[PDB]
């Protein structure tokens, strides 16, 4: 009957739901302060509260929308779908949870939007020349990955300001390379040239039309260019139903956030688009560089993968930046850039080998635990991702959505999406902690029989100044009567020490360092045994001084674990199969075995007196292992009969025993037959 909420939720209909998923509470005077309250649904149900007055909400896992996952990227009309659930309805109760799953496929033939963002520093003039054959060739090789690929183009040459640019010391650097019998272009920060197009032959021509500029400061403006290419969807030509590949091609180290201080650039980068009608970054002289933080958030939020097509001698910085820009990839570029075709095809294949989920707008009170199915039906806990996938393969994530306490009565949208994917799961989450009869309540002073109080969930509830079992003994004074069962067995305390009986219920006057709950002031939130300066070492919660252990802990002080890896032996058996596990350690078995797993046993009757027991049952149907029906699993040794126990010359133990039939049987116990235990039992005892 009396279980948890018996003492913890009786004072409040919201509290009983706050306290435990098993509790219910009747209304409409079904059990008009009969005796038990809250308890378990089933106890009230049996004690005349079977009708739906019980106010017993349950948690639920429902799917609002499940458009089926698609096999092919070109399969337009119905939107090509990359994940299975689309919209999910989640209903929680306090300290409860529900499971769901996320199926994600690396859909085959999925369209590709690729932008070629080029380093336009003078060392690249021969690259622009080599690249004259790309676009056409890049797309051609990519036709195998997908039938639909678009190619765009842009460039960067660093911020056109005093310390980066040759400062325009003279006029001569307004249109540079006058220094070396040639001509080249001025510095522009970031430029956009070609939006993404299916007419990829346009790239061949657009790159031939370009030429390089001069940079004094070796570090590149590549981070502004990446961020703008990443952010400016409207010009870059990113279509949401496509993978976005930003290819960054360069021969040099990048310039980063707050380095811009040298040019008087101190304005924070807000991660916004600043490219105007001239397809030019107008912020190139006023805004600083984006941080690794900003790049990561914007490319993740908008599903842009970055490919670093970087020459060999600077790879160390790009690889290290990618570690701090998750989801990106870095390859090695040839000095003539002829391998961009291959670099990109492999970079794409690498990008599509990882499935990773991110949850947007997740509230502080909810915890989403993941177990990721990386292979077959095996799941690894603590993972938002799986590695080693091919295009056309799937990944399956198991998610547990748990809520702590009782968060506010608002509907929140948890967006669970693979990174780089447009499709996402919207989980719509609400919290059922109220009783319907909590809202359907009209306190109104009167109605609590003859009195002044409140009313909820089918019963009256007089507050301070009126209290009583129903409506009486405001501050005692009608109290020196009625007695009542204020304590078990009528042992006559006023109320279990910390409290006093008040007209059928006790009132706890204590208000120091915690709370007291229950009819007889039974539950002390603050009073239990410390293990090392803390109640039960922080490995459980207390209720009435009784500590309720957490997962994988036991004992009064919750310091005895139920974890067994520390008492497990090298053979996979707890206590090596000969001993008892206790508090993460091992209790010695009678023959005299010793050590953490009973590894050593110098006294132990030789194995022959333990192995005969197996032979005696597996072959002769006698012994403890026969009577206990245990030999078949206990003895995993191979036992063979032989006509003769031969001079093997190897590690064979000569064992012997006299049986129930007054016969003497000899056998040999041989160790390490390619890791197996082999017994040779004479056919003729």
């Amino acid at each position: 009957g009396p279980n948890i909420c018996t003492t913890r939720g009786v004072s409040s209909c919201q509290q009983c739901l706050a306290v435990s998923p098993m509790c219910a509470w009747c209304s409409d005077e079904a059990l008009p302060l009969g005796s038990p309250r809250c308890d378990l649904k089933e106890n009230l149900l049996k004690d005349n509260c079977a009708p739906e007055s019980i106010e017993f909400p349950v948690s639920e896992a429902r799917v609002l929308e499940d458009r089926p996952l698609s096999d092919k990227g070109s399969g337009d009309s119905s939107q090509v779908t990359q994940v299975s659930p689309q919209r999910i309805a989640l209903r929680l109760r306090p300290d409860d949870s529900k499971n769901f799953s996320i199926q994600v496929r690396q859909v085959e033939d999925y369209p590709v939007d690729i932008y070629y963002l080029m380093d336009l520093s003078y060392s690249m003039k021969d690259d622009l020349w080599s690249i004259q054959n790309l676009g056409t060739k890049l797309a051609t090789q990519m036709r195998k990955l997908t039938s639909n690929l678009r190619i765009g183009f842009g460039a960067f040459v660093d911020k056109p300001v005093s310390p980066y640019m040759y400062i325009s010391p003279p006029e001569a650097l307004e249109n540079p390379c006058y220094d070396m019998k040639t001509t080249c272009l001025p510095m522009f920060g970031y430029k956009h040239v070609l939006t993404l197009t299916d007419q990829v032959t346009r790239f061949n021509e657009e790159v031939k039309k370009q030429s390089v500029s001069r940079n004094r400061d070796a570090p590149e403006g590549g981070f502004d260019a990446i961020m703008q290419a990443t952010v400016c969807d409207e010009k870059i030509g990113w279509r949401n139903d496509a993978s976005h590949l930003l290819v960054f091609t360069t021969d040099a180290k990048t310039h980063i956030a707050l380095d811009g201080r040298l040019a008087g650039i101190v304005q924070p980068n807000d991660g916004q688009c600043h490219v105007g009608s001239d397809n030019h970054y107008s912020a190139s002289t006023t805004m600083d560089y984006p941080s690794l933080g900003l790049m990561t958030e914007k490319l993740s939020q908008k599903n842009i993968n970055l490919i670093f097509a970087v020459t060999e001698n600077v790879v160390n910085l790009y690889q290290n930046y990618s570690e701090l820009i998750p989801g990106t990839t870095v390859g090695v570029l040839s000095m003539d850039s002829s391998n961009v075709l291959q670099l990109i095809v492999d970079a794409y294949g690498k990008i599509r080998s990882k499935v990773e989920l991110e949850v947007r707008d997740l509230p502080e009170e909810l915890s989403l635990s993941f177990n990721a199915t990386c292979l077959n039906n095996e799941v690894i806990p603590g993972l938002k991702s799986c590695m080693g996938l091919k295009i056309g393969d799937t990944v399956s994530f198991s998610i547990e959505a748990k809520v702590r306490g009782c968060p506010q009565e608002k509907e929140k949208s948890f967006t669970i999406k693979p990174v780089g994917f447009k499709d996402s799961l919207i989980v719509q989450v609400t919290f059922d902690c109220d009783c319907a009869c909590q809202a359907q309540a009209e306190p109104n002073s009167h109605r609590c029989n003859n009195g002044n109080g409140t009313f909820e969930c089918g019963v009256c509830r007089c507050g301070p100044g009126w209290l009583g079992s129903q409506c009486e003994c405001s501050e005692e004074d009608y109290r020196p009567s009625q007695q009542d069962e204020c304590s078990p067995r009528e042992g006559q305390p006023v109320c279990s020490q910390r409290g006093e009986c008040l007209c059928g219920q006790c009132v706890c006057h204590s208000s120091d360092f915690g709370k007291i709950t229950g009819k007889y002031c039974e539950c002390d939130d603050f009073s239990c045994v410390r293990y090392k300066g803390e109640m039960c070492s922080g490995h459980g919660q207390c209720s009435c001084g009784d500590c309720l252990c957490d997962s994988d802990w036991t004992g009064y002080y919750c310091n005895c674990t139920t974890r067994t890896d520390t008492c497990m032996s090298s053979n996979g058996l707890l206590c090596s199969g000969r001993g008892k596990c206790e508090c993460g350690s091992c209790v010695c078995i009678q023959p005299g075995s010793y050590g953490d797993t009973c590894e050593k046993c110098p006294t132990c009757p030789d194995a022959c007196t333990f192995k005969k027991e197996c032979v005696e049952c597996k072959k002769f149907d006698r012994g403890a292992l026969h009577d206990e029906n245990t030999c078949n699993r206990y003895c995993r040794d191979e036992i063979e009969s032989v006509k003769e126990l031969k001079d093997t010359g190897k590690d064979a133990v000569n064992c012997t025993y006299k049986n129930e039939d007054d016969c003497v049987v000899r056998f040999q116990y041989y160790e390490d037959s390619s890791g197996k235990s082999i017994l040779y039992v004479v056919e003729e005892p």
Partner: antibody
Amino acid sequence: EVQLEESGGGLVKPGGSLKLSCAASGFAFSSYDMSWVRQIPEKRLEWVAKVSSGGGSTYYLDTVQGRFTISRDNAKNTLYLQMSSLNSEDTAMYYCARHNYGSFAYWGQGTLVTVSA
Amino acid sequence: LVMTQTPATLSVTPGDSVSLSCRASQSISNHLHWYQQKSHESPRLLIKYASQSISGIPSRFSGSGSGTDFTLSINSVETEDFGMYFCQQSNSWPHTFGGGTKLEIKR
């Protein structure tokens, strides 16, 4: 103080050749670009050729290219212009000049070249 | 590239002010210089890079302009200002000079 002195001008028969020199002192000769600019009888100035500070890059007027060579000896602090296949159009006062980022900041006194039969 | 320079000749009474104008067929940013040439003497840089004067050149000489149109103004012309003036472009190969202006002093 910058000192520039050109020499070697004179009368050359058409189709001929002639080498002009320009000595320099008072400055770090190898730290600056050098140019030859000529003043045609109409008093028009025309840039002829440029040699970079280290001598690596050499630029010529299109109607001069393939006939003239500009060179320098940074140890001898002397600039040269070796002309060949000379025409009447090449008659002019030749001036060597020191650069300041595209400008000709300092000029010589001039050496007169006459191309005539 | 063609550098057009006007006026070709100029007669200025001492104390009066004048200006010369340089026109480039394309944009030459600020890559335009001005020179002065007196009789039996070589050209001298007056103004470099459209408006930057030099070191011992009077403030009376002030250059201005960008791209395609540049000026050289001379406030209160002195007797010693007589002589030829030239603009020169350093943007694109070959470098080019304007036709030149002959400044004469009225007396």
